[PDB]
Amino acid sequence: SAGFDRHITIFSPEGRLYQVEYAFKAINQGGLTSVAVRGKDCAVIVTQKKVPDKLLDSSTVTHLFKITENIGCVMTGMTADSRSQVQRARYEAANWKYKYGYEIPVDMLCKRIADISQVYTQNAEMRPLGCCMILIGIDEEQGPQVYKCDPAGYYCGFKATAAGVKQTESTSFLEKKVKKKFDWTFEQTVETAITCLSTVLSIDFKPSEIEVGVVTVENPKFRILTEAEIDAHLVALAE
Amino acid sequence: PGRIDRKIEFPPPNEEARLDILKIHSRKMNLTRGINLRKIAELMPGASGAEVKGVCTEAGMYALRERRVHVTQEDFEMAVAKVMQKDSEKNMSIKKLWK
Amino acid sequence: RYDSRTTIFSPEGRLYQVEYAMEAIGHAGTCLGILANDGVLLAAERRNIHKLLDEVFFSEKIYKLNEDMACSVAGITSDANVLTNELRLIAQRYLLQYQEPIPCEQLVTALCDIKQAYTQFGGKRPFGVSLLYIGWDKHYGFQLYQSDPSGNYGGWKATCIGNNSAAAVSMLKQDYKEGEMTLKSALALAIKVLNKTMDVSKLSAEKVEIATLTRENGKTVIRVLKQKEVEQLIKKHEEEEAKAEREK
Amino acid sequence: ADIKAICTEAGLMALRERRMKVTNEDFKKSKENVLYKKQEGTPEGLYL
Amino acid sequence: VQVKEQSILELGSLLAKTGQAAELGGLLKYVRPFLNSISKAKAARLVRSLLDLFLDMEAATGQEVELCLECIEWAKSEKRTFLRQALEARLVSLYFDTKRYQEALHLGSQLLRELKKMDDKALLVEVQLLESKTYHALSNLPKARAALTSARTTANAIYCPPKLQATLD
Amino acid sequence: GYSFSLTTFSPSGKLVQIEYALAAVAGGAPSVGIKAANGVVLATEKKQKSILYDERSVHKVEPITKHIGLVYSGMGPDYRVLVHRARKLAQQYYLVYQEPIPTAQLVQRVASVMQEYTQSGGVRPFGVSLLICGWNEGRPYLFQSDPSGAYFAWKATAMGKNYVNGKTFLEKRYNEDLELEDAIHTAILTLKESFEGQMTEDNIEVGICNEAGFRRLTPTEVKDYLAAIA
Amino acid sequence: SIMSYNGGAVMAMKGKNCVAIAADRRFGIQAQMVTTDFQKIFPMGDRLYIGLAGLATDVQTVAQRLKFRLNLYELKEGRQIKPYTLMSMVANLLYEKRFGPYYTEPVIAGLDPKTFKPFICSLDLIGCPMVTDDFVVSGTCAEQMYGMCESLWEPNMDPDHLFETISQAMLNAVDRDAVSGMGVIVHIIEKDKITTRTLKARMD
């Protein structure tokens, strides 16, 4: 190679820089995969858990993180960087309500998160937070939205989302899935959010190995599903 | 200077000198008439003289593909710009960073 | 090697970063100024005159800085705009303090102390900019000065700096005038000098620039003269060239 | 060896302008012709 | 003003579509003081338009080449460069329509003494290309190869050869 | 050994890291700016990776004031920094002078911002060049900055991938004056010159400067121009 | 008051295509005069002046700070300054000393740099701008100047009758004031030229 040894955050003669694009493979040491789907008035997060020990608890494992009453998120990547990322998200959501007097849009929150990650690329002397964040929320006169924020400081909004280890396989499914014209009537959404992940990993859980966050324009509160109603939808797509 | 006593440079030639070398190599060539060799050497700001031959070969090469023996002043006007060749420095950002 | 910051000294012993900066001025444009009684002038070279540009400023090398001084520029554009914004702000600070214009030398020493100070404190890049000075005062009249990346300066009667500005000084000494220093004698000398440096034939008026500074009834006007009147100055030089070979 | 080259070259310059005695000018032209081939690199203006 | 101008162009479209030439040939003589009423550089296209509607009726060889030589003599008497070059390019195309032997080439010689000398570039690509037809029409194969290649190197510096590309192809 | 830092020179020439940052501009999306007789046309190239990405989320043509627009070619996340910088800096003129800032005046100041990240010694320069447009005092303006800090004024130019083809195109393709509409027809034709796929209303994104202010086009407006576009 | 420490009077008046401005000449401490040639009208470019009145410290101080900001403005831009732009510039300079304020009240008069359009405005001691169409006044003898200008002003006036109106306004109002006088200077400017006259006033 030309071989700058990429020790700090400077350029290469090819034109790119390697330390930030080493953080994209820093997500993959979580050993995890997450999916968000926006089809209609509802939006669904789905993510598996991995409990390796019986001494380890169950309630303190969940990656679903409630940011505000109407905005929830899911975190991938390594664990310790993910929770500190959430603390800035909870903090700056409350400064919006204080400064501006109304509830923050889900679109504006990813601009604030990505700009914090941008400074760590532009200015040196802080490790750039190897974790990824996926949001959901309801916006009036806009419907529901799904956003992803990258460690580079990139964000975009899009319908079907994969993160973790198996992006390219799961996104290959959803292109084949979301090319037709469906109406996604809240059990159409949850079923595909399972069955996009239910071509990929070849697992078979009894219904206690995932988490599902949901939001809906009938109750815009963020909502983590019950183990019983997870079992309901797991045999409702499923005859 | 105990060993080598004369150290002699060789600059690229002048317009009169580019005129003269052109006269040397076009001697055996077969010029038409009405042709100005002075303006041809005016078209070379900083030639070597090993490429004044290259003009004389390519002008004769243009007549060869026609199965012809003639020449024009315009044939040299094409051959000078053929021999002279630049980098054509792109994007102007390098060139104007550095004013 | 001794490739580090501006600190340190080499053994034997000199300063390589200053030498790399001062040598790199030879890759810049070309600027010069001449002797004159009752006036002073500057001349410069348009680089990169590709046809998809606008020239919305019509004044690029020249920066009228106070009211009766201007300057050329040569070097990195990034460092060039920093100094010109600084140097105009020096002169108004003096004028606020005394209500009298800055007398054309201690302006220069004020900048050269700033340009010096990045060579001693680390870790800063020295300014890779050299530039000239023209001006009039109460104490000496018309003047010329020569800035350096080191922070050194000097007062000249005719000088040049830039791309091929090592042989242009030889023509200045070959055509040195003294006593006779009129502007028309000085303008006619300037177009001949740029003809030697620039290898572009016939010397298009879109490739040069001429700015003058005269003294009229207590005003000290500054003229950046337009492309229409460069034409009578070029063809006059073209006329004098064809007439000069009639003796042969 | 620089001095001996100057002494030979100044003698050659007198033969060029057809002489035997050697003026001051032959030593001036010998000094310019012989010496300027190596002298490269000095910080003029930087010191004083 | 314009309602009298378009009424003549209303009659001018009638003389073209319905197929009559003697009253149309009078109209080509009628519009000659009418020319100096609009833009000078865009008056030539209106003359080009009325000439194309004049020629594309029928092979009536009694008046076509004669009225074209008349307007050239007006361009001798009025001296507009772009208008006379518009008339010369059509005339040498008309010379090729009957395959005139020398004067088609002699007209192409006398115009290209100036076209490579003047400032325009786009018209030169066509008249170099039209000579490559007539040197091939005289069955001079190496010269037509030579004139075509000189048209190739000229053709690479124009805003649009939008239809002239396929003509060259 | 000189290609790793910024505060020192090379023994012969210039700064290495600024030249490497300009290589990042060449690897960006293509973009075209054309200054017409009455307006300025900006145009860029917006292809998403998959079908999944929404096109109405992130924009390229971006207003700064009501008469000042701005595009780029480089890295998108660094673009959002100096946009928000140029917004807040445009208001500071207006709080002082009570007058909309002229387009020559921002580019004095925005380049001085991009200046400051080329200093010592633990920051990186930007990897974004810009194209700035505006119609101030009748005559329009079209400027271009760079990560070094220089700034210019083009009749027409292009940046991004395959720009040298677009330079040679627009070198053949410019005249002194066309209208604002014919500038749009020739700005889509040069974006089509280097493109891969069917150019639709969502693959491109176009904004213009009238003398009546800055506005970016809706997809319906951009469809109808691209419909019957030569 | 502090405004009544040195006195002063500045008047501007709008004409047809021209504009006039006038001031007194007396400098003095509270009751004792010192000199009769104190400048209170300062040129800010061509066809655009400014007048200052109030505490004579802040008269000379603000006129130097404003000249400091003007020359930096006219070098970053090749154009000259517009009259609205100067009014926004002065009101910024006064409001920065919001709680330590300069004791002066400026009056700006001038023409448009491109067209011929006249312009007059005046400001408070903290920077509230106020544009009018007939006249503005400032100084200690304000109420005397309102009584003259409300009666003598006409809408469309040549530079002859504009000169005679502002002369009769300034001579009669200042002679009723105690701490203002000792001569009156008048600038009348227009598109073609600038006329400066000094009037024959009571020196008592």
Domains and CATH numbers, chain F: 1-230 (3.60.20.10)
Chain centroid to CA A14 = 32
Whether the CB of C55 is below 8 Å from some CB of chain F: the reply is: yes
Alpha-carbon distance of E158 to B39, in angstroms, equals 28
DSSP secondary structure letter of residue F125: P
For residue C136, the one-letter residue type is W
Q: What share of chain F is helix, strand, coil (3-state, %, to 5)?
A: 35, 25, 40
- Chain D neighbours among C 89-148 (CB < 8 Å)? 148
With H, G, I as helix, E, B as strand and everything else as coil, classify residue G194: strand
Contacts of A197 (CB under 8 A, 6+ apart): A33, A35, A46, A48, A170
Q: Return the residue in E121, E154, E160 with the most chain F beta carbons within 10 A, the one to mutate for interface testing.
A: E160
Here the tokens at position A177 are: 């899935």
Place of tokens 């003003």: E1
Q: What share of chain G is helix, strand, coil (3-state, %, to 5)?
A: 30, 25, 45
Whether the CB of F171 is below 8 Å from some CB of chain C: the reply is: yes
8 A C-beta contact, residue A236 and residue A187: yes
Whether the CB of G77 is below 8 Å from some CB of chain F: the reply is: yes
Cross-chain Cβ contact B91/F148 below 8 Å: no
H/E/C letters for each residue in chain E?
CHHHHHHHHHHHHHHHHCCCCHHHHHHHHHCCCCCCCCCCCCHHHHHHHHHHHHHCCCCCCCCHHHHHHHHHHHHHCCCCHHHHHHHHHHHHHHHHHCCCCCHHHHHHHHHHHHHCCCCCCHHHHHHHHHHHHHHHHCCCHHHHHHHHHHHHHHCCCCCCCCCHHHHHC
8 A C-beta contact, residue F43 and residue F30: no
Chain centroid to CA E161 = 17
Terminal-residue alpha carbon distance, chain A:
56
8 A C-beta contact, residue C29 and residue C197: no
Contacts of B7 (CB under 8 A, 6+ apart): D37
H/E/C letters for each residue in G79-144?
CCCCHHHHHHHHHHHHHHCCCCCCCECCEEEEECCCCCCEEEEECCCCCCCEECCCEEEEECCHHH
Whether the CB of B1 is below 8 Å from some CB of chain D: the reply is: yes
Prior bond to C123 cis, omega within 30?
yes
Chain centroid to CA F22 = 14
Place of tokens 């150019």: F199
Dihedral angle over CA of F212, F217, F222, F225, nearest 10: 0
CA F152, F155, F158 angle in degrees (round to 5)?
80
Neighbours of chain C (3+ CB pairs under 8 A): B, D, F, G
Q: Which residue of C has its CA nearest to B46?
A: C199
With H, G, I as helix, E, B as strand and everything else as coil, classify residue F129: strand
Handedness of CA F90, F96, F99, F105 (dihedral sign): negative
Nearest Cα neighbor of C225 from C15, C25, C62 is C62
Buried (b) or exposed (e) across E26-50, using 16+ Cβ within 10 A? ebbeebeeebeeeeeeebbebbeeb
Alpha-carbon distance of E91 to E149, in angstroms, equals 24
Handedness of CA C92, C98, C99, C102 (dihedral sign): negative
Q: How far is C201 from chain G (nearest CA, A)?
A: 33
Contact present, E and D (at least 3 Cβ pairs less than 8 Å):
no
Q: How far is D4 from chain C (nearest CA, A)?
A: 30
Neighbours of chain A (3+ CB pairs under 8 A): F
8 A C-beta contact, residue E69 and residue E76: no
Handedness of CA F18, F21, F26, F30 (dihedral sign): negative
Alpha-carbon distance of F221 to F6, in angstroms, equals 46
The resolution, in angstroms to one decimal, equals 3.3
> How many inter-chain contacts (B to C, CB under 8 Å) are there?
27
Cross-chain Cβ contact C88/G64 below 8 Å: no
Whether the CB of F98 is below 8 Å from some CB of chain G: the reply is: yes
R_g (Cα) of chain C, nearest Å: 19
8 A C-beta contact, residue C209 and residue C234: no
Alpha-carbon distance of A208 to A221, in angstroms, equals 23
Contact present, C and E (at least 3 Cβ pairs less than 8 Å):
no
Q: How far is F168 from chain B (nearest CA, A)?
A: 11
G1-204 falls under which CATH superfamily?
Aminohydrolase, N-terminal nucleophile (Ntn) domain (3.60.20.10)
Cross-chain Cβ contact G77/F97 below 8 Å: no
Please report residues of B whose CB lies closer than 8 A to that of F129: 93
Here the tokens at position A165 are: 């280890």
Candidate from C20, C52, C78 with C-beta closest to F157: C52
DSSP letters, chain A, are ----TT-SS---TTS--HHHHHSSTTGGGG--EEEEEE-SSEEEEEEE-----SSS-SGGG--EEE-SSSEEEEE-S-HHHHHHHHHHHHHHHHHHHHHHSSPPPHHHHHHHHHHHHHHHHHB-SS------EEEEEEETTTEEEEEEE-TTS-EEEBSEEEEES-HHHHHHHHHHHTTS-----SSHHHHHHHHHHTTTS-----TTSEEEEEEETTEEEEEEPPHHHHHHHHTTS--
Here the tokens at position B39 are: 């303006």
Domain spans of chain G, in order of start: 1-204
Q: Quickly count: other Cβ atoms within 10 Å of residue F102's Cβ.
A: 18
Cross-chain Cβ contact C64/G64 below 8 Å: no
Nearest Cα neighbor of A36 from A141, A154, A178, A204 is A178
Handedness of CA F182, F187, F192, F197 (dihedral sign): negative
Terminal-residue alpha carbon distance, chain E:
45
Alpha-carbon distance of F161 to F29, in angstroms, equals 6
Place of tokens 């500054």: C222
Q: Which residue of G has its CA nearest to C95?
A: G68
Half-sphere exposure of A19 (CA within 13 A, CB side): 19
H/E element, F219: helix F219-226
Here the tokens at position F187 are: 């700005």
8 A C-beta contact, residue F174 and residue C71: no
For residue F227, the one-letter residue type is A
Contacts of C150 (CB under 8 A, 6+ apart): C18, C22, C115, C116, C119, C126, D45, D46
Please report residues of F whose CB lies closer than 8 A to that of B92: 152
8 A C-beta contact, residue F60 and residue F47: no
Please report residues of C whose CB lies closer than 8 A to that of B95: 47-48
Q: What phi, psi does A196 have (nearest 5°)? A: -70, -45
Alpha-carbon distance of E129 to E108, in angstroms, equals 11
Region class of A204: left (phi > 0), else alpha (psi between -120 and 50), else beta: left
8 A C-beta contact, residue G92 and residue F96: yes
H/E/C letters for each residue in chain C?
CCCCCCCCCCCCCCCHHHHHHHHHHHHCCEEEECCCCCCEEEEEECCCCCCCECCCCCCCCCEECCCCEEECCEEEHHHHHHHHHHHHHHHHHHHHHHCCCCCCCHHHHHHHHHHHHHHHCCCCCCCCEECEEEECCCCCCCEEEECCCCCCCCECCCEEEECCCCCHHHHHHHCCCCCCCCHHHHHHHHHHHHHHHCCCCCCCCCCEEEEEECCCCCCCCEEECCHHHHHHHHHHHHHHHHHHHHHC
Cross-chain Cβ contact C152/D46 below 8 Å: yes
- Chain F neighbours among A 36-95 (CB < 8 Å)? none
Please report residues of B whose CB lies closer than 8 A to that of D2: 1
Q: Which residue of F has its CA nearest to C82?
A: F112
Q: Quickly count: other Cβ atoms within 10 Å of residue A18's Cβ.
A: 15
For residue A21, the one-letter residue type is E
With H, G, I as helix, E, B as strand and everything else as coil, classify residue B49: coil
Q: How far is C75 from chain B (nearest CA, A)?
A: 6
For residue G100, the one-letter residue type is G
Cross-chain Cβ contact C28/B99 below 8 Å: yes
Buried (b) or exposed (e) across F56-78, using 16+ Cβ within 10 A? eebebbbbbbebbbbbbbbbbbb
Nearest Cα neighbor of G172 from G148, G195, G188 is G148
Contact present, C and D (at least 3 Cβ pairs less than 8 Å):
yes
DSSP letters, F74-116, are S-HHHHHHHHHHHHHHHHHHHHHHSSPPPHHHHHHHHHHHHHH
For residue C10, the one-letter residue type is S
Taking CB atoms within 8 Å and a gap of at least 24, the contacts of B6-9 are B7/D37
Contact present, C and G (at least 3 Cβ pairs less than 8 Å):
yes
Cross-chain Cβ contact C55/F153 below 8 Å: yes
Neighbours of chain F (3+ CB pairs under 8 A): A, B, C, E, G
Prior bond to C13 cis, omega within 30?
yes
Dihedral angle over CA of A8, A12, A16, A20, nearest 10: -10
A74 burial (CB, 10 Å; 0-12 / 13-18 / 19+) is buried
CA distances from F152 to B33, B91, F47, G93, G140 (A): 50, 13, 28, 33, 53
Nearest Cα neighbor of E86 from E120, E30, E125, E45 is E45
Whether the CB of F1 is below 8 Å from some CB of chain A: the reply is: no
Contacts of G23 (CB under 8 A, 6+ apart): G8, G9, G10, G11, G40, G41, G51, G53, G184, G185
H/E element, F190: helix F180-191
Please report residues of B whose CB lies closer than 8 A to that of C80: 99
Q: How far is B48 from chain E (nearest CA, A)?
A: 28
Cross-chain Cβ contact C199/B95 below 8 Å: no
DSSP secondary structure letter of residue B43: T
Please report residues of A whose CB lies closer than 8 A to that of F52: 158-161, 171, 174-175, 178
Half-sphere exposure of A224 (CA within 13 A, CB side): 15
Q: What are residue G104's DSSP bridge partners?
A: G54
Experimentally, the structure was elucidated by cryo-EM
Q: What share of chain B is helix, strand, coil (3-state, %, to 5)?
A: 45, 0, 50
Please report residues of F whose CB lies closer than 8 A to that of A107: 57
Alpha-carbon distance of C155 to C143, in angstroms, equals 7
Nearest Cα neighbor of A215 from A75, A106, A119 is A106
8 A C-beta contact, residue C65 and residue C91: yes
Terminal-residue alpha carbon distance, chain B:
42
Nearest Cα neighbor of C146 from C173, C179, C169, C122 is C169
DSSP letters, A141-169, are TTEEEEEEE-TTS-EEEBSEEEEES-HHH
Edge-to-edge strand ranges of the sheet holding G194-199? G135-139, G9-14, G19-24, G184-189, G194-199
Cross-chain Cβ contact F150/B97 below 8 Å: yes
Candidate from G76, G77, G88 with C-beta closest to F98: G88
A198 burial (CB, 10 Å; 0-12 / 13-18 / 19+) is middle
Alpha-carbon distance of E74 to E70, in angstroms, equals 6
Query: Where would I find the beta strands (DSSP E) of chain D?
Result: none
Whether the CB of G88 is below 8 Å from some CB of chain F: the reply is: yes
Contact present, F and B (at least 3 Cβ pairs less than 8 Å):
yes
Here the tokens at position E139 are: 């069955």
H/E element, F72: strand F68-73
DSSP secondary structure letter of residue F49: S
Buried (b) or exposed (e) across A53-73, using 16+ Cβ within 10 A? eeeeeeeeeebbbbbbebbbb
- At what angle are helices A188-197 and A227-234 packed, to 10 degrees? 80
Q: What are residue A156's DSSP bridge partners?
A: A148
Q: Quickly count: other Cβ atoms within 10 Å of residue D23's Cβ.
A: 13
Please report residues of G whose CB lies closer than 8 A to that of F105: 76-77
- Farthest CA pair distance, chain B: 59
A235 burial (CB, 10 Å; 0-12 / 13-18 / 19+) is exposed
Alpha-carbon distance of G141 to G53, in angstroms, equals 11
With H, G, I as helix, E, B as strand and everything else as coil, classify residue F53: strand
DSSP secondary structure letter of residue G202: -
8 A C-beta contact, residue G119 and residue G110: yes
Half-sphere exposure of A89 (CA within 13 A, CB side): 30
B50 burial (CB, 10 Å; 0-12 / 13-18 / 19+) is exposed
8 A C-beta contact, residue E15 and residue E23: yes
Chain centroid to CA F160 = 10
Q: Quickly count: other Cβ atoms within 10 Å of residue A159's Cβ.
A: 19
Alpha-carbon distance of B77 to E114, in angstroms, equals 19
DSSP secondary structure letter of residue D23: -
Here the tokens at position E117 are: 């000398």
Please report residues of F whose CB lies closer than 8 A to that of G76: 105, 108
Prior bond to F121 cis, omega within 30?
yes
With H, G, I as helix, E, B as strand and everything else as coil, classify residue G57: helix
Alpha-carbon distance of F230 to C231, in angstroms, equals 44
Please report residues of F whose CB lies closer than 8 A to that of A158: 50, 52-54, 57
DSSP secondary structure letter of residue G54: B
H/E element, G184: strand G184-189
Contact present, E and A (at least 3 Cβ pairs less than 8 Å):
no
Q: Return the residue in F2, F3, F6, F8 with the most chain C beta carbons within 10 A, the one to mutate for interface testing.
A: F8
Alpha-carbon distance of B96 to F5, in angstroms, equals 22
Please report residues of C whose CB lies closer than 8 A to that of B88: none
